[PDB]
Design a protein around this nucleic acid. Structure first.
Lengths: 73, 75, 82, 106, 69, 135, 70, 53, 65, 76, 76
RNA sequence: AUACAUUUUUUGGCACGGACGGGAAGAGGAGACGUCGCGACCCUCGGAGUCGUUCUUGACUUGGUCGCUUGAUGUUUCUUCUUCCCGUUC
């Protein structure tokens, strides 16, 4: 699982999750809330660990809905 | 606790102004006096009166209204 | 006595079925439950003025099925025997 | 060449016409009737149907053996019992959903 | 077979949401295995009470949402 | 490793995070899926052309990441990291589609690539994870 | 004292009218059962208090019934 | 050459690949046409025979 | 015999079977209804050879001598 | 899809499901009932212009409201 | 006995979602369930309007969503 | 290897060159009442977690508003033609 933050919190939750799924499907088979605490963040879970590492290195700072995303394990 | 059957029995004993509502039918109501009792909600109610609901009065005789289409009772 | 029994006896019949919502259903009855739940194969759903939708397997519920349109050739008296 | 040309002839009533469903004394009146407004109307409205009827005719003739075969089948199934009719249906079904070549052929 | 456990709601005022987008109010007095309700009377939802006590049939109840906690 | 009926039948099948099938040089024999999937994942394969599909009425999402798509013969189409090079090669998408992603394709660096897609495929609402705006 | 079933029994071979889940009816009652299905003779179909047709010999299914009346 | 050739998509089960022709359906439609039920499957076939002549 | 039905279908037909639920096997079947999207007036009816029927549908059966 | 006899024998298959209201529940049948109630593993309610879509999850579905069930795909 | 019923019972405690025939979705902690799906729920929203302790009669219930943890064990 | 139909399920309260489609313009589709969305001058600003007992479990908590500058959708009353473009079919 990778933890993403610095995401544009204006996107509706279901759209955010569907774009997240689409974007991250390129690395392997793939949780986001809008509470005050959790807004602008998401946890993306992959079946394979190598997929998570590849995603992390390749999409670090990728412009998503206008902002550069920050990814971490 | 006061069961429904018991209540019905009490009503019957009394002979009081009962106003029945119809299931899945807003516009109409019934108003009479309970005469009968059944294992199900079905009863016979002599001197009944059909009522159009306020969103007057209409003529009606003695009737048994069937248990399945009952909703409300009061007596 | 029972029509359920009769229904059960009717096996492997290519039949139309009509529902409470009017949907016409062309399919082969592989089986039916004691409570009229129809299990069809080689199924074809059409509405009563619009296009058709075909399906391989459909288990329709007993409460829905208004009228099962029976086959062309059928010996009814024989079926009705216990 | 034949059907619409008075192919149906009777020694008594003469020549019948598929389109107008009437007979005719001689070939002469038959020919001078094929230009009349009536026959024009009919042959112009009921053409497709007449032709389809004809096809049903000749194709059913070419399939006489199949027609008979089926009628037979009908009578058989009809004279079956419950178990019999069921087993027969089973057979038709198996024939229907069976490989065209068995792993056990010569 | 089993009794509807409405002993929590006994002697409390309840919104009986009933068939056909209607409502009833009133304090709960009794019930049975079919979920018929016997209740000391209240209004039909502006508002107007009918009856001293009331009995609602089981089938008719959509919901019985508690007014009191 | 032909995309075959046998291949599709042993393929991981699951409900994704829609019904999705987990999946090659040529797209073929999709008939065997029986139109039972909302999504099909064809990522990391060697497909050259997005073509060869049977009539599939269910199919709403196509994830085609890291393949070799250079030509195009449905609501979401993800084509990230493929080989589309000319704006004109994207023309067949006008006949479909609301979510489109073509990132990491040479075509991306062509002058006016974004405006070209917007005018030729107006049904797209989100392009490359950015909202198509009125301006 | 008067329950419904006995009343029903009493009212056999007598005029009755039935409303439905709606159209009014009017006919002489032939017989009844526990399920409250009906069999009537000289049936007249009161379409909201308008005798549309006189059917005669009929059998009413129980679940569509609303009420019985003289 | 013809690996995806399937007869069952051309013949119904009641036709048995040309053995029989399914005319029950047409017996139905026929009942619908004559506006009655005095007509049996066999009487319908008896009707069809006319077209052999 | 004729049967009235919940969905506005006058079923004129020959009865074959009968049970507790008032389900019926029917021969010589002739239904009567009206396919009509308003304002319109059409009266339609179709012949069916053999037909099973469910009982909840049945409102009132009748016999015309 | 296979040529089954009953519903019980086709347990855990991905299922299309219609209900009286007109919604379409899709998901794997985990468990059946005497009254045709269905447990669905990964359930998606699909309602109708064009298909509106909602992912539900693990769903108990009452048989009263169920009209008919169809097979969407194979297992796994 | 019904396995869906069992599942429902198990879901007691958990936050179930719950739509009726009317089409009025609820979400809440499942307080009590019976053989007939006579559900009680706490802290329940009602599609929106917040409300305390709703009771619902299974007859009028359409479908129930249970949390996906119950998928795991150990009823099936 | 040799079993039944009268409130919670299934006896229901159901029902009333030629076509086609989309979009735009010009002439002689429009009004409620709701329910979920494109933008923003705005608002707003950040299965998990704890404990008792024992080598693994039981308890307790947890987008709203304005526009559309021609967004999407049911109920419910009343009363189309021509031209241009793009796609399917023959």
């Amino acid at each position: 699982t990778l933890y993403v933050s610095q995401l544009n919190e204006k996107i509706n939750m279901q759209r955010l999750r569907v774009n997240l799924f689409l974007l991250f499907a390129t690395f392997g088979e793939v949780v986001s809330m809008n509470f005050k605490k959790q807004r602008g963040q998401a946890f993306i879970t992959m079946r394979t660990i190598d997929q998570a590492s590849l995603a992390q290195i390749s999409l670090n700072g990728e412009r998503f809905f206008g902002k550069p995303l920050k990814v971490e394990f | 606790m006061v069961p429904p059957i018991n209540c019905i029995f009490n009503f019957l004993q009394q002979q009081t102004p009962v106003t029945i509502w119809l299931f899945e039918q807003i516009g109409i109501r019934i108003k009479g006096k309970i005469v009968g009792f059944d294992e199900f909600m079905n009863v016979v109610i002599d001197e009944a009166v059909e009522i159009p609901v306020n969103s007057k009065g209409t003529p009606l005789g003695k009737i048994l209204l069937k248990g399945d289409n009952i909703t409300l009772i009061t007596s | 006595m029972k029509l359920v029994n009769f229904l059960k006896k009717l096996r492997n019949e290519q039949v139309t079925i009509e529902l409470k919502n009017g949907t016409t259903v062309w399919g082969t009855l592989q089986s039916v439950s004691p409570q009229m739940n129809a299990i069809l194969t080689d199924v074809k759903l059409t509405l009563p003025s619009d296009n058709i939708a075909s399906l391989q397997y459909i288990n329709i519920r007993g409460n829905t099925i208004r009228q099962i349109i029976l086959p062309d050739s059928l010996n009814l008296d024989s079926l009705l025997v216990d | 060449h034949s059907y619409c040309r008075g192919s149906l002839r009777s020694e008594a009533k003469g020549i019948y016409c598929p389109f107008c469903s009437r007979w005719f004394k001689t070939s002469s009146v038959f020919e001078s009737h094929l230009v009349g407004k009536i026959h024009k109307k009919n042959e112009s409205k009921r053409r497709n149907f007449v032709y389809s009827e004809y096809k049903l005719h000749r194709y059913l003739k070419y399939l006489n053996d199949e027609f008979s075969r089926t009628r037979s089948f009908v009578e058989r199934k009809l004279a079956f019992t419950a178990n019999e009719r069921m087993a027969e249906m089973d057979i038709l079904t198996q024939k229907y959903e069976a490989p065209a070549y068995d792993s056990t052929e010569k | 077979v089993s009794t509807p456990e409405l002993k929590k709601y006994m002697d409390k005022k309840i919104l009986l949401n009933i068939n056909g987008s209607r409502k009833v109010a009133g304090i709960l007095r009794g019930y049975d295995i079919f979920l018929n309700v016997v209740l000391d009377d209240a209004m039909e939802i502006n508002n107007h009470q009918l009856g001293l006590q009331t009995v609602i049939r089981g089938n008719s109840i959509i919901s019985l949402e508690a007014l009191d906690a | 490793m032909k995309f075959t009926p046998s291949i599709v039948i042993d393929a991981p099948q699951y409900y994704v995070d829609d019904l999705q099938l987990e999946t090659e040089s040529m797209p073929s024999s999709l008939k065997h899926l029986t139109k039972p999937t909302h999504i099909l994942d064809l990522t990391n394969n060697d497909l050259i052309m997005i073509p060869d599909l049977s009539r599939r009425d269910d199919i709403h999402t196509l994830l085609l990441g890291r393949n070799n798509i250079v030509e195009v013969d449905v609501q979401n189409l993800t084509l990230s990291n493929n080989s589309i090079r000319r704006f004109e090669d994207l023309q067949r998408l006008r006949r479909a589609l609301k979510n489109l992603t073509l990132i990491g394709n040479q075509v991306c660096h062509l002058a006016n690539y974004r405006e070209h897609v917007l005018r030729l495929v107006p049904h797209l609402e989100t392009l490359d994870f950015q909202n198509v705006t009125a301006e | 004292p008067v329950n419904p079933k006995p009343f029903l029994k009493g009212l056999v071979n007598h005029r009755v009218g039935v409303k439905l889940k709606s159209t009014e009816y009017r006919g002489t009652l032939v017989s009844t059962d526990n399920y409250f299905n009906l069999q009537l003779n000289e049936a007249e179909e009161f379409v909201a208090g308008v005798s549309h047709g006189t059917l005669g010999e009929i059998f009413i299914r129980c679940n569509n019934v609303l009420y019985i009346r003289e | 050459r013809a690996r995806d050739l399937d007869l069952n998509e051309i013949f119904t089960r009641d036709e048995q690949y040309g053995e029989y022709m399914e005319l029950e359906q047409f017996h139905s439609l026929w009942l619908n046409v004559i506006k009655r039920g005095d007509c049996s499957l066999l009487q319908f076939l008896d009707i069809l025979e006319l077209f052999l002549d | 015999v004729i049967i009235s039905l919940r969905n506005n279908h006058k079923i004129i037909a020959r009865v074959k079977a009968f049970d507790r639920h008032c389900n019926m096997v029917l021969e010589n079947v002739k239904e009567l209804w009206t396919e009509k999207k308003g304002k319109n007036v059409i009266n339609r009816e179709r012949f069916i050879s053999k037909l099973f029927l469910r009982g909840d549908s049945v409102i009132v059966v009748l016999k015309t001598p | 899809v296979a040529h089954s006899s009953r519903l019980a024998n086709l347990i855990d298959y991905k299922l299309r499901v219609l209900t009286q209201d007109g919604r379409v529940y899709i998901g794997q049948l985990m468990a059946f009932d005497k009254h045709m109630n269905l447990v669905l593993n990964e359930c998606i309610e699909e309602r109708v212009i064009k298909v509106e879509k909602r992912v539900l999850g693990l769903t108990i579905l009452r048989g009263e409201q169920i009209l008919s069930t169809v097979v969407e795909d194979k297992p796994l | 006995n019904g396995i869906p019923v069992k599942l429902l019972n198990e879901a007691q405690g958990h936050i179930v979602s719950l739509e009726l025939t009317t089409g009025a979705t609820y979400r809440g902690k499942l307080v009590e369930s019976e053989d007939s799906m006579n559900v009680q729920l706490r802290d329940v929203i009602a599609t929106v309007t917040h409300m305390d302790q709703i009771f619902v009669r299974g007859s009028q219930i359409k479908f129930i969503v249970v949390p996906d943890l119950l998928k795991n064990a150990p009823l099936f």
